[PDB]
Design a protein around this ligand. Structure first.
Ligand SMILES: [Mg+2]
Ligand SMILES: [Mg+2]
Ligand SMILES: [Zn+2]
Ligand SMILES: [Zn+2]
Ligand SMILES: [Zn+2]
Lengths: 292, 45, 49, 261, 49, 48
RNA sequence: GUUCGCGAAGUAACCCUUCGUGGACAUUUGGUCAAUUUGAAACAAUACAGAGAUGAUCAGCAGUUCCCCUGCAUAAGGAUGAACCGUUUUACAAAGAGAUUUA
């Protein structure tokens, strides 16, 4: 009689805005994604005319031990993933606390019947205990390779050119890109600075960033967009006995620009990975030369 | 909100209790604490 | 239901195995309602899944 | 928009052109419960797809758009859907607007609506996990995809870059010649899930690539999930992005306490 | 009978099958009862060894 | 569908409801393909 | 769409059509489920190994395990169905003797 007596665990976000919702109870529905035991399952639709039926995926015993919604698998108090909720509590306390998972099919079956609890749920279930840690969150917010030769590649790189502001080509050269900064954030700011939203469906611009050579290659379409890109680049460095470069300004990181006019084709940055690591060290000297 | 619980009517030809299958489950120790126990010849025996 | 090779037929295949318990009941209803030799054809009410 | 919002979605495959539900011929007699061939030995029964997705050509409005459907047609991702504008699922690539509507549901489901599992798989196959948000797609079978012709590893990298570029915001790509493996990371989970179904069991070779007549005999390029990245630069970078996204929700977890008071 | 056979196909055969005392296992079962009854009476006469 | 779910595809069921082996069976397949009276009584009844 | 009432038109012993209006009647289906490879039948074949006790060859029946198959089965079979025939140091002292050794 232990099957049908404990009540369900649905958060207010899954359940919706509707006044009174009809649900369907099935006493031996699916089995639990966590414990792999049969349990009573619940159907509901948020509105009466939804396209999608919401289904309880885990049982109530496995949800109580993690203090989570049976559908979201998110926290019942904070609505955050378990992969995050342990890491935030591991910052407030100097101890490290986690939710361990059983790999073996019978040991995960053994694990669900014990009525203790585990992970951060022993904090997040109590209202008084969980408030002290959210209080301490505020105080933290108050606290605020040489042997391989790369020469044939380095001649193709247009090391010595300017923003001459001529039409030239669609093609440009980027470098000083560091091990960070995914390619979408580059192509977003270039689209944000040029002004066009939804760059990808128009297919106006093309990017290649190698991320091991630390350099990047840019292509446009419809060349009148290309000079408008140069028309928006304000920051410059006039190198002392050299040719000027325009600078992209992502947060805290600087990307310097040369018009290509002959560059393309992958091999341009390096064939293997070690050949890119050697080119990383080649440009690291040249960027130090460029600033000082 | 509110919750109205409705049992769905099953196809009589379908395998009723689609979760039901013979399985072995080793069960943990029950939660209640332990009760106190309260309580020559070797050459003969 | 002559050729059940699609995955759309997986629940109906479990219904054919549930029907096997009730097959000797359907045989009795067929055989007690058989045409007698003075009639050419008989029409009968049926119940089908 | 130019492709999707103005058009209606077209029919990739007619229903009479749809492939037979019977698999080819593996053993001696066909089992009609499990729909497999029995009594013999199987002969490495994988095969390449005769169809594929054409993002700009095939996208368009569907009946799932008018009804408010969250999820995407998996047969549209495969290039197989026969309903066209009648289909109850979305025929276009997932974007930042629809992915914002896949927020509560995407924790346990994928973009097609399929439940995720606790354990991954022994070979990192079909659906994902609800324990780990994995945005990186492993690519394998590249020898089988190229139909055993040779190319340089720099040129293989570009041929992987182009066909994957359309399927969403590509974070980074790093083709390895030592192990013939592509590690393609996206911005979103929902675009990795879309791209995994879309380029599974395809061909890499282009129509001008001199083997476009013969490409059906292959096995296609395997697309499984990617394991954790062993080099220590990305692990520190993993530690970095763990910390900064933590502080973002350190802000909002004291705002809903501020709402509580 | 068909109900029992079909239930075994979808749910399996239980692992809690208790086999009865029939004429082929009677001498084995007498053994176990006499062996348990002798250990009971002797272990209650021993002090605490 | 019952014969196929067991894996017994070397057992052929004709349309007059005869169950026919197609093959010489191993010892393992012979133990596996013995059907009970409840199968065979149902088959003879369909046959009448 | 039907019907009741109302307001008009044309025909008109107020009747038949047609247009404009009020009320009535009838009221929320279905999904735990999307159509081949990546969320999971099996076997056969091949290769290796070989089916209890014992000096040796054999009838067997049990019990123990977070072991099953066949069978309607609480029957009976499945190598006597299978797996078990390996490893084992402290509730611990009493008596004495030597030697070392210190207020
Ligand atoms: Mg035995
Ligand atoms: Mg026996
Ligand atoms: Zn559970
Ligand atoms: Zn929820
Ligand atoms: Zn579709």
């Amino acid at each position: 009689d232990e099957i049908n007596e404990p009540p369900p665990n649905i958060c207010e976000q899954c359940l919706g805005d509707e006044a009174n919702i009809r649900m369907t109870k099935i006493p031996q529905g699916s089995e639990c994604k966590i414990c792999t035991l049969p349990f009573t399952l619940y159907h509901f639709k948020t509105s009466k005319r939804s396209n999608n039926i919401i289904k309880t995926l885990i049982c109530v015993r496995c949800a109580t031990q993690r203090n989570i919604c049976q559908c979201c698998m998110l926290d019942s108090r904070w609505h955050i993933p378990i992969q995050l909720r342990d890491h935030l509590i591991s910052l407030v306390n100097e101890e490290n606390v986690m939710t361990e998972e059983a790999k073996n099919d019978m040991m995960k079956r053994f694990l669900s019947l014990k009525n203790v609890k585990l992970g951060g749920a022993q904090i997040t279930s109590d209202p008084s205990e969980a408030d002290n840690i959210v209080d301490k969150l505020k105080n933290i917010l108050l606290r605020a390779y040489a042997s391989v030769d790369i020469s044939h590649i380095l001649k193709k790189l247009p090391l010595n050119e300017s923003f001459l502001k001529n039409p030239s080509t669609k093609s440009f050269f980027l470098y000083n890109i560091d091990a960070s900064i995914p390619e979408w954030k580059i192509t977003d700011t270039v689209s944000q600075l040029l002004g066009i939203k939804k760059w990808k469906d128009g297919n106006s611009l093309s990017l290649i960033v190698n991320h091991k050579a630390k350099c990047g290659g840019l292509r446009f379409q419809s060349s009148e967009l290309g000079e408008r890109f140069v028309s928006k680049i304000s920051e410059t460095l006039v190198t002392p006995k050299g040719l000027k470069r325009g600078v992209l300004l992502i947060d805290r990181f600087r990307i310097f620009i040369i018009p290509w006019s002959s560059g393309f084709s992958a091999a341009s940055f390096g064939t293997n990975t070690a050949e890119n690591i050697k080119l990383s060290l080649s440009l690291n000297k040249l960027i130090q030369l460029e600033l000082g | 909100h509110h919750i109205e619980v409705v049992s769905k009517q099953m196809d009589p030809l379908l395998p009723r209790f689609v979760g039901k299958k013979a399985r072995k489950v080793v069960a943990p120790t029950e939660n209640d604490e332990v009760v106190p126990v309260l309580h020559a010849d070797p050459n003969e025996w | 239901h002559s050729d059940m090779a699609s995955k759309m037929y997986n629940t109906d295949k479990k219904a054919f195995l549930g029907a096997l318990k009730y097959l000797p009941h359907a045989i009795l209803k067929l055989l007690e309602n058989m045409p007698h030799p003075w009639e050419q054809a008989k029409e009968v009410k049926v119940l089908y899944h | 928009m130019t492709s999707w919002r103005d058009k209606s979605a077209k029919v990739q495959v007619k229903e009479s052109e749809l492939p037979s539900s019977i698999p080819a011929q593996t053993g001696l007699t066909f089992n009609i419960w499990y729909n497999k061939w029995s009594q013999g030995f199987a002969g490495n029964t994988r095969f390449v797809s005769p169809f594929a997705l054409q993002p700009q050509l095939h996208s368009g409005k569907t009946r799932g758009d008018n009804d408010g459907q969250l999820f995407f047609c998996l047969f549209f991702a495969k290039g197989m859907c026969c309903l066209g504008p009648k289909c109850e699922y979305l025929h276009h690539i997932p974007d930042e607007e629809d992915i914002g509507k896949l927020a509560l549901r995407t924790e346990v489901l994928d973009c097609f609506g399929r439940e995720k599992f606790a354990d991954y798989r022994e070979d990192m196959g079909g659906i994902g996990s609800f324990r780990k948000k994995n945005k990186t797609l492993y690519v394998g079978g590249i020898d089988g995809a190229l139909n055993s012709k040779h190319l340089k590893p720099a040129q293989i990298e570009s041929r992987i870059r182009f066909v994957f570029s359309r399927l969403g915001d590509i974070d980074r790509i790093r083709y390895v010649e030592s192990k013939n493996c592509g590690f393609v990371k996206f911005k979103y989970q929902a675009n990795a899930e879309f791209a995994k179904e879309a380029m599974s069991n395809q061909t890499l070779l282009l129509p001008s690539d001199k083997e476009w007549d013969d490409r059906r005999e292959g096995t296609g390029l395997l697309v499984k999930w990617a394991n954790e990245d062993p080099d220590p630069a990305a692990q520190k970078r993993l530690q970095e992005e763990l910390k900064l996204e933590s502080l973002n929700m350190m802000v909002h977890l004291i705002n809903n306490n501020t709402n509580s008071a | 009978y068909i109900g029992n056979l079909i239930t075994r196909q979808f749910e399996g055969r239980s692992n809690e099958i208790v086999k009865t005392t029939t004429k082929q296992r009677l001498d084995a079962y007498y053994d176990l009862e006499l062996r348990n009854s002798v250990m009971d009476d002797i272990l209650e006469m021993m002090p605490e060894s | 569908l019952l014969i196929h779910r067991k894996g017994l595809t070397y057992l052929h069921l004709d349309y007059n409801f005869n169950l026919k082996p197609t093959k010489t069976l191993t010892t393992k397949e012979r133990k596996k393909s013995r059907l009970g009276n409840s199968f065979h009584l149902m088959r003879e009844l369909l046959k009448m």
